[PDB]
């Protein structure tokens, strides 16, 4: 046999995997990556998703667009080249964005954000909101995905200011961001 078996380095966060090796390699955007791929035989290591002949892969200041599945194809041609592969789930949470709209009296607040993983949306008015005559929802055209707070009929005192608290459950050391809009 000609073997291979991957171990993490760089900047992981709260590690989880399965029966073979590390399914997941979570990393934050802006950090550094290092994935060391072991050998038995000797073989020639191969990282790929033009086949880079580095033993250890490395990327400084890792971006969202660099995430994906990479494999390690180590080989001296002693039987089948062993191929262990790994997920690079690059993580982030942008500045969230907030539009609106008005008529008789209904007011919508649309809240997008690009994130990875998919963000969790929370709506406030001093303290947090969920169902009396006031609705929240997700849509089909999830270009974010997005969240919408609808005010059904403007009652005297739901004229205050609101916040769209987005969160990624604080995972991989990433702060919660939010956004405010006022009403009159």
């Amino acid at each position: 046999p000609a073997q291979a078996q991957i171990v993490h380095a760089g900047q992981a966060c709260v590690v989880k995997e399965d029966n073979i090796s590390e399914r997941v390699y979570t990393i934050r955007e802006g950090d550094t990556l290092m994935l060391q791929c072991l050998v038995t035989g000797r073989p020639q290591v191969r990282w790929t998703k033009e086949t880079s002949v580095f033993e250890t892969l490395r990327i400084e200041r890792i971006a969202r667009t660099q995430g994906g599945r990479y494999y390690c194809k180590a080989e001296n041609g002693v039987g089948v080249p062993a191929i262990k592969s790994i997920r690079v789930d690059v993580q982030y949470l942008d500045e969230p964005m907030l539009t609106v709209h008005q008529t008789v009296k209904t007011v919508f607040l649309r809240c997008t954000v690009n994130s990875n993983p998919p963000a969790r949306f929370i709506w406030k008015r001093g303290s947090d909101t969920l169902s009396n005559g006031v609705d929240i929802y997700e849509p089909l055209y999830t270009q974010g995905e997005t969240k919408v707070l609808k005010l059904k009929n403007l009652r005297p005192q739901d004229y205050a200011s609101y916040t769209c608290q987005v969160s990624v459950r604080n995972v991989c050391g990433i702060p919660d961001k939010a956004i405010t809009f006022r009403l009159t």
Partner: peptide, 23 residues
Amino acid sequence: ASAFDFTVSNFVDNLYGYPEGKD
């Protein structure tokens, strides 16, 4: 695009908007 969603939401609400299973 997303104004389509909106005006429909108000469609369902002032007509069928009972609205236990509106979504």
